[PDB]
Write an enzyme that holds these catalytic residues in place. Sequence first.
Site, PDB file in Angstrom:
ATOM      1  N   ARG A 285      -5.846  18.019   7.151  1.00  0.00           N
ATOM      2  CA  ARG A 285      -4.967  17.868   7.776  1.00  0.00           C
ATOM      3  C   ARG A 285      -4.582  19.673   8.400  1.00  0.00           C
ATOM      4  O   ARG A 285      -5.694  20.208   8.626  1.00  0.00           O
ATOM      5  CB  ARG A 285      -3.912  17.212   6.816  1.00  0.00           C
ATOM      6  CG  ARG A 285      -4.870  15.824   6.245  1.00  0.00           C
ATOM      7  CD  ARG A 285      -3.872  15.059   5.606  1.00  0.00           C
ATOM      8  NE  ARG A 285      -3.956  13.102   5.533  1.00  0.00           N
ATOM      9  CZ  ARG A 285      -4.225  12.218   5.914  1.00  0.00           C
ATOM     10  NH1 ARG A 285      -3.381  12.409   6.808  1.00  0.00           N
ATOM     11  NH2 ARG A 285      -4.668  11.561   5.641  1.00  0.00           N
TER      12      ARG A 285
ATOM     13  N   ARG B 249       0.928  -1.370   0.076  1.00  0.00           N
ATOM     14  CA  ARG B 249      -0.037   0.155   0.029  1.00  0.00           C
ATOM     15  C   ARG B 249       0.783   1.348   0.276  1.00  0.00           C
ATOM     16  O   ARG B 249       1.735   1.083   0.902  1.00  0.00           O
ATOM     17  CB  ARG B 249      -1.200   0.040   0.847  1.00  0.00           C
ATOM     18  CG  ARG B 249      -1.588   1.413   1.729  1.00  0.00           C
ATOM     19  CD  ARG B 249      -3.109   0.749   2.336  1.00  0.00           C
ATOM     20  NE  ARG B 249      -2.998   2.560   2.767  1.00  0.00           N
ATOM     21  CZ  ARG B 249      -3.303   3.042   3.978  1.00  0.00           C
ATOM     22  NH1 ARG B 249      -2.290   2.685   4.747  1.00  0.00           N
ATOM     23  NH2 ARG B 249      -3.723   4.228   4.135  1.00  0.00           N
TER      24      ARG B 249
ATOM     25  N   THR C 179      -7.026  -1.113  10.270  1.00  0.00           N
ATOM     26  CA  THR C 179      -5.592  -0.160  11.617  1.00  0.00           C
ATOM     27  C   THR C 179      -6.109  -0.271  12.956  1.00  0.00           C
ATOM     28  O   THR C 179      -6.916  -1.274  12.739  1.00  0.00           O
ATOM     29  CB  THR C 179      -6.857   1.159  10.687  1.00  0.00           C
ATOM     30  OG1 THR C 179      -7.311   1.287   9.618  1.00  0.00           O
ATOM     31  CG2 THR C 179      -6.710   1.987  11.965  1.00  0.00           C
TER      32      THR C 179
ATOM     33  N   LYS D  66     -13.169   2.583   0.558  1.00  0.00           N
ATOM     34  CA  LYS D  66     -12.827   3.133   1.936  1.00  0.00           C
ATOM     35  C   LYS D  66     -14.153   2.890   2.351  1.00  0.00           C
ATOM     36  O   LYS D  66     -14.273   4.280   2.067  1.00  0.00           O
ATOM     37  CB  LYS D  66     -11.936   3.298   2.114  1.00  0.00           C
ATOM     38  CG  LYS D  66     -10.213   3.355   1.485  1.00  0.00           C
ATOM     39  CD  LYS D  66      -8.763   3.082   1.663  1.00  0.00           C
ATOM     40  CE  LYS D  66      -8.629   4.237   3.148  1.00  0.00           C
ATOM     41  NZ  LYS D  66      -7.961   5.000   2.975  1.00  0.00           N
TER      42      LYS D  66
HETATM   43  O1  LIG Z   1      -7.772   5.496   6.142  1.00  0.00           O
HETATM   44  C1  LIG Z   1      -7.911   4.431   6.682  1.00  0.00           C
HETATM   45  O2  LIG Z   1      -6.681   4.141   6.196  1.00  0.00           O
HETATM   46  C2  LIG Z   1      -8.189   4.364   7.860  1.00  0.00           C
HETATM   47  O3  LIG Z   1      -9.066   5.375   8.929  1.00  0.00           O
HETATM   48  O4  LIG Z   1      -8.292   3.597   8.467  1.00  0.00           O
END
Ligand SMILES: O=C([O-])C(=O)[O-]
Lengths: 500, 500, 501, 501
Positions: B94, B53, B305, B247
């Site tokens: 950010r 990644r 995560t 995602k």
């Molecule tokens: O964006 C990501 O990878 C998360 O929030 O886990």
Amino acid sequence: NKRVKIVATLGPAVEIRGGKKFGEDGYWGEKLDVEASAKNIAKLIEAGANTFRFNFSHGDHQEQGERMATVKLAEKIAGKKVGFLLDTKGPEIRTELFEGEAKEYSYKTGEKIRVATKQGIKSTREVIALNVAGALDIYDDVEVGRQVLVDDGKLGLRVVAKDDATREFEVEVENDGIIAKQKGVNIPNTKIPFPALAERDNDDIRFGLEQGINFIAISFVRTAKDVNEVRAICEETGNGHVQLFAKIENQQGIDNLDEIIEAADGIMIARGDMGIEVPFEMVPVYQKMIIKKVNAAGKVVITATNMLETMTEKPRATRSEVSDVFNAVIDGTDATMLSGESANGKYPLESVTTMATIDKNAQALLNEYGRLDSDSFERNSKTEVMASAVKDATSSMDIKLVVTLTKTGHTARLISKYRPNADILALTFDELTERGLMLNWGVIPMLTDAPSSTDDMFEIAERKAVEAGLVESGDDIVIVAGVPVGEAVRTNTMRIRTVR
Amino acid sequence: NKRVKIVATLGPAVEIRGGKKFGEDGYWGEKLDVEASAKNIAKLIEAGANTFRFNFSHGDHQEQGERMATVKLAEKIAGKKVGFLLDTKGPEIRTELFEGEAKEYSYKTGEKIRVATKQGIKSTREVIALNVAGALDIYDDVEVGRQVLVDDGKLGLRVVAKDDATREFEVEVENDGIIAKQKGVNIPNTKIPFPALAERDNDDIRFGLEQGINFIAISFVRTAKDVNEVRAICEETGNGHVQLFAKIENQQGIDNLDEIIEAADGIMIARGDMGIEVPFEMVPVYQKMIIKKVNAAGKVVITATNMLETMTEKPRATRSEVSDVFNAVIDGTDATMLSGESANGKYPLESVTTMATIDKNAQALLNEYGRLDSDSFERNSKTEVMASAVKDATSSMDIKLVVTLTKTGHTARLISKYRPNADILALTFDELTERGLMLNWGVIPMLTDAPSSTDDMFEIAERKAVEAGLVESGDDIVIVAGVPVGEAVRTNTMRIRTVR
Amino acid sequence: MNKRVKIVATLGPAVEIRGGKKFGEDGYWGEKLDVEASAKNIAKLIEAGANTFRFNFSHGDHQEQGERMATVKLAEKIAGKKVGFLLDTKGPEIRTELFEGEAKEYSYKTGEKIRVATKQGIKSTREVIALNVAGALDIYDDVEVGRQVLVDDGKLGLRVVAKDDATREFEVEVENDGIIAKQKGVNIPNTKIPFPALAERDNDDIRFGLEQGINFIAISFVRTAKDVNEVRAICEETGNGHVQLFAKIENQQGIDNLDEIIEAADGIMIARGDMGIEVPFEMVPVYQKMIIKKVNAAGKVVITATNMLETMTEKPRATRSEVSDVFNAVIDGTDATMLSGESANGKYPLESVTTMATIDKNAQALLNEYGRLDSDSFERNSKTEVMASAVKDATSSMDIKLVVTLTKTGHTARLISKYRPNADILALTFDELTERGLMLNWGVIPMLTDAPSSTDDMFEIAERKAVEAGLVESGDDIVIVAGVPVGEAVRTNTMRIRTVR
Amino acid sequence: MNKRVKIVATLGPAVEIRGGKKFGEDGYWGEKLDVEASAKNIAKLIEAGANTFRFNFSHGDHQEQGERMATVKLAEKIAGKKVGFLLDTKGPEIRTELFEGEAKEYSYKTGEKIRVATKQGIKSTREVIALNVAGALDIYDDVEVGRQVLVDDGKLGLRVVAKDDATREFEVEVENDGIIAKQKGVNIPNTKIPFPALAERDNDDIRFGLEQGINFIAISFVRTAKDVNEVRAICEETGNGHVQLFAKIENQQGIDNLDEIIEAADGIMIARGDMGIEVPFEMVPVYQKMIIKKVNAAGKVVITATNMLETMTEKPRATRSEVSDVFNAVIDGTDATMLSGESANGKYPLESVTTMATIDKNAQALLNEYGRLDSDSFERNSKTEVMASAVKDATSSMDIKLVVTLTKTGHTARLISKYRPNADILALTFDELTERGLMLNWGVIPMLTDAPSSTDDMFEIAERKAVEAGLVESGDDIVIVAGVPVGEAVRTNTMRIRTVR
Ligand SMILES: O=C([O-])C(=O)[O-]
Ligand SMILES: O=P(O)(O)OC[C@H]1O[C@](O)(COP(=O)(O)O)[C@@H](O)[C@@H]1O
Ligand SMILES: O=C([O-])C(=O)[O-]
Ligand SMILES: O=C([O-])C(=O)[O-]
Ligand SMILES: O=C([O-])C(=O)[O-]
Ligand SMILES: [Mg+2]
Ligand SMILES: [Mg+2]
């Protein structure tokens, strides 16, 4: 297509003798008209009889041999083959003949008459003679207070005494009815030491073996020894291809069922004698357990006796008979049987049609109600692993037909055992294997040329399925085979194919 | 063999620059030492990372491109290929930079400071600047009493007021910690209208597409439109082979999950942002439901995560981290992910080894505890019928390996979906399909020559399985293929073979 | 071992002594009914396990039906055991008329040519069979050449080969050897005879039976819910609201309307005789299994009927197919099995009940391994039903000899019986109508006791009544349910697990 | 929504105010304990849903433990809610000694070379770490060169690189950056240290805790059933037979002997910290799921412990892996989840309890879809258990707001909790020891009431207590169980389904 197989007992009922149908004037006087008789039998075959049972409890070797020859012509008229099953006399007891012009007698409750053990004599209204297997003397095997039952329990006699001077039972008639020749006699709770295999049976089998048969139903199997004794004669005469169905019809049979199943190729549940020899209310328990255990062993189970009894005399069965056939299929039987219905009654063709109609309807409800559970089996070999994968494919999508190319029928038997939601076309390469598969659930046996190493067996499967009328354009079929021919040890390949 | 696939985020942690390991003196000053860096990455690959990644939330295009080139060499050192996954910046927020020598600040509960919406400025200890996606003005999207969270919720700010004169939030620090550059900022319960697809992402993707990638993970997927927008760029550049993992990291994602699953090739469960954007206690509910639904659709699910967070700083994970990885596998995840653990920490190799060890142990317990149920699927095609029959064969007997000869990977994907009790060797004929299968559960992709109509594909399956070390003499394997090559429409054949 | 599956036995001349003469001895019909000796025969069928007697009003007149019911009331006093009283209606049916010279019947041979009269109010001769059509309808314009007229559950087929407009007679050919007797069912498949909503004959029969005292009515040829509702209205109007209605399903309209029929009825009698002629014979086992499951899911009674031990009309032992049919009806989930000719008309009525009892008792011991009914599938739709579910659970968790319910109307006993617990159900009720009204529910042993006072220990009573009945002995575990306390409880609200002293 | 999964919170300085100073403010240790202000903090953790406080005797002395237990007794009066009192023993373990100059700890860098002393009865320095070995054993001949000495649940590794026979010291290399603090667990995998059957220190700690008043003992490093029996003998001998023993499984011998340990104990604490160093870390989730299933099948209590919300020691929100671990422990079937450093030693003790409570409450609502425990598999081995099964059935048949058991010893409440009904369990008991003794059983809300007289309506009491607790309102259906009547009943023998007025 009918997946539940029908065993039809043949007899005079289908046999035109000298232009006279069964039961008419000087019928047993005229001689058998083979071509006309054969046309009748062809009609049973077209109606869904998959095997003919020749019962060696009635008829000299000459009657059997001629009947067996009539079926051979019948197959040629019908253009369809059937199996040939021989049912042994076995360790049983019958009623000889009556002195004078008598064929039977009228009896009344409380009436006191006699039963003879003296072998090879004659019957009088006051003295019924017992024709025993191999002329044994049963006088010292039967106690006062025992029951002698005649015509499948239709008539009962209470042993009230024993006359040592004549070796006769003094019997009080329990209820009203018929005494007849070669009419079964049960004496339940009786340890008569009949032989592992009588001579008359030995002889009957060899006769049947020389005529050409596929199956032997061995009456009154008690122990594996009774099966092994018949196996011996089968291997010795070079008829090792013949399958042995143990007839379980007494407590000893039920006690040694596991060892009998191992030695046999199958079980005929012979409910006639079983329901006299053991408590009648236990027969439905034994029926369900025997069907489950025989299916688990990958073998053939036939349910027999009284299935459409009433259609002996009437064109329509009772509601209990339709129920019984239906429930045999749901229990998971490979085959249903007719005896007197096809052999002896006024509606043999109608009996076969009726059983076919019930069996076809019940098969549509096996998903919903069926008792057999293939998910519980151990897959004990790579062919069996494949039979499991075939069942899975038939559950995952609409499969019109499973085709197996099978040398000895082993793959067809394991596919049948799993009860796929499809008919099983078994392409084999000799008549013995073809006829030998005719009592396996769902199996449509078909003779074809043994494939060469350059043949496409998947093209042969499709074309033989189309030829036989079982599939058309757009149908999905599952084909299994040992590929490549003459390198494969076993069925190792499964192909999902859409018919061209 | 490890069936659960590992996505390892790459970063400075593995990259030796000018002879200096990550975190040392004038490290970011020295330039990247490619061959040494590549030897480190090769070690991650050997330890079981199946895909790298590249997170486009950190690093110019030059950092990414050079890192991507280092992996290409790493594959050659290791003698094993991996997938290349690009993670988009997406509609996020950010923390810019601090005026003077500052990189961070110490804050205390009840302390009142400021947050700026004025795009493209600088941060002061009393005035944190928000770098927003595409420089949007969020001042009129955020109400008093809302929460601004920094460093994945590690630090909270309560909006106590709004200054119209400067377009600044007045914030009271809720707890003590770190403010940092490009450090995530969540403002949950906030309807900021970010674009269906920002320009910077459009640009990042095309850059990644030109470097050569197999997978795009699209941050903050809200609707199918976000997937379709990226699909468009993939088809338009002639990279139609690239797979899109949506995602899911907010309530809108979860609300449109069914439509997102249909448009996507898979879901990355991005628990970092999801557990801030929705109630943290609901994330384990959504995790299990998303794994079930993606598996049911025959697609790829990655769990992401904090999986081994502690191993950022320590050689051994906590008991909750080992539990979390273990339970992701039991839930049925295709893949587990490392972020900071592999990208940014002191034990990236150890992180990969540790995740591999947990994943391998958990796989041994899927029979006992596994949540996925293939028995419940509709078999919606003849290839899927075959994947079902393969699963059946692997349940009926001990299967060392399933081999599929697959043009586009479709058969390998449907076999993977069914979670057979076997490793899946996928023999394919181009590098794009080989790399494209590297996140599917149990799939070992291998490049081989496209078979001719005269080849024996069952001999090729066996020999490639032996070459790869996956089987030896006496092992049983299941091979599927479209036979014959260039006549078969799809996978139509299953063979059970014992290795020579 | 208590028989949980209930038996309905049809009564007729077979148990009846006339002037010291047994059934089918000469001049039998010449003599008067020996009530005491007939009641003594009937007491033996009660002892062998007949739970309810069927009085078929298709056969005989009010006088014969009334005398027979009085003989049964005497039999109950001789046996010391009560039974249910079930009346079976004629319904929208055709029956053969009486014959001239009160001949009972004639035999016919295949190919014989005879006539069937449509004119109502006449007697048959051997050559001209007359029909009693419900509603005294003229059926001549309803039956075409080529139709089959079937007599006695399809035993004898008659092909219609021509029609004589002068006499409105059918010319028919005998298709098979058999018998045309008086008052026999007649079916004419694929005709649409417009039978009335409720025949006046049925109205009169039901009202006469309600007067004698009955617990149940089996309504012949239920076509829709309106056929059940018409009979319900008469039971309510006459103050017999306690009488239970079993719809007889025996034609395609009944099968089509099954759901609304089950809703309107207290139960279903699967009348296989007519059903297996009015629909494809091979469909009857499908309809049987499906009706048993639906009627049990509705908390109601199902009776499986006809041909169950047919051979025992003439012989002392049943066929293997007959024992199979009885055993499979139990496995299917039937509350009750029925005897018709076997008990009404045969040489072995006592032995028929004894044989059925033996098969039923054996089959109940295999319900755990083979039973089709699945109570885990049911919605528990009330608090009494939740308690019925909990009783079942208690009888699955441990060896329970007996469940005891103190039940005012039998509702708790019906809901416990629905769940088919692995135990006998002792229903302690406070009136004879509720008591007789539970005699066809699976597993229920109804027993009369005093309504308990608000100061009685109902759990002590339950145990004592169970011990006095010989159902339990010291050490046995029993489950008892009651609405506690009496006068405050709205329903069964209490379960007690109790070890007998 | 009531929290069915119970919370054990470890207490330590983190909740304690000293001279108006909160934890880790300067001179904190300088000041005296503000009992009232500390008790007020603790009352907040009771309100947030801590059901039992853990007192870890591996840390502090009798005086600190005794003062802390007295502060909790005050907290219960301030909260108006009782909690359980759990003592955690040292066991056959190694801990780091106190340091000279009462330094609390030192930081070390990878490659640093230091010593570990084996001589007992001394203090550590930064360069020479001393060990408190259970039984004051000399371990020098037990540890070879090449062994790993791990400090604080394996946070810091020390490699043994040589042995000095002159001082019986180990020369060790720091393998990773970290901290050696006072009184920290020390593991030395693949050594066989002959720890005593019961350490004298444990004997004294248990006897001191029994004197203060405890409900539970968690026995560290249970190796066999004899380790449980040794503690049982002290609880019985001192007249504390009501105290429940939870065996801590945290080494391979404990895992090997699990069956006999579960048999001898009242419950298991899955002590994952030590377990995940003494066995392969990747086996701990296997052992966790298996221990929860076996302890629930035995009708006993299981506590899942250590690292559950570790990050909340320092931060206000847990990691995604931490929320997952808590949620999955509930799905696995845990009766209880535990906080250690999070509640004892951290900046967010109140928030840690609140966060666990929130996760636990959410996870319980998914037990129907995902729960691993299967009560249908259990043998019901007694009549109370049959009743527990029937209660579960009633809560599956219909919407039950609450189960109420009138329980003398808690046995009925334990057997109902074992079956994990779809309802809260109100346990009405008649003494505080039984009341506190049920506070770690899944779903149980213990409440003190008067022992009912033989003339009381226990069903009226059940309803009133439930209504006064605010658990139910008019229209709610509740299931109530009791041994009726009081003074005659040998056990819970009665279930009542009741609608609240
Ligand atoms: O964006 C990501 O990878 C998360 O929030 O886990
Ligand atoms: O059987 P399905 O699911 O309809 O799939 C058929 C499609 O899959 C393919 O067979 C591809 O499978 P492979 O990439 O595994 O070879 C295509 O040729 C074909 O069109
Ligand atoms: O022998 C037989 O066939 C029988 O008894 O059924
Ligand atoms: O009426 C009946 O009972 C029948 O037809 O079966
Ligand atoms: O002791 C404990 O609680 C552990 O080790 O987890
Ligand atoms: Mg009828
Ligand atoms: Mg520990």
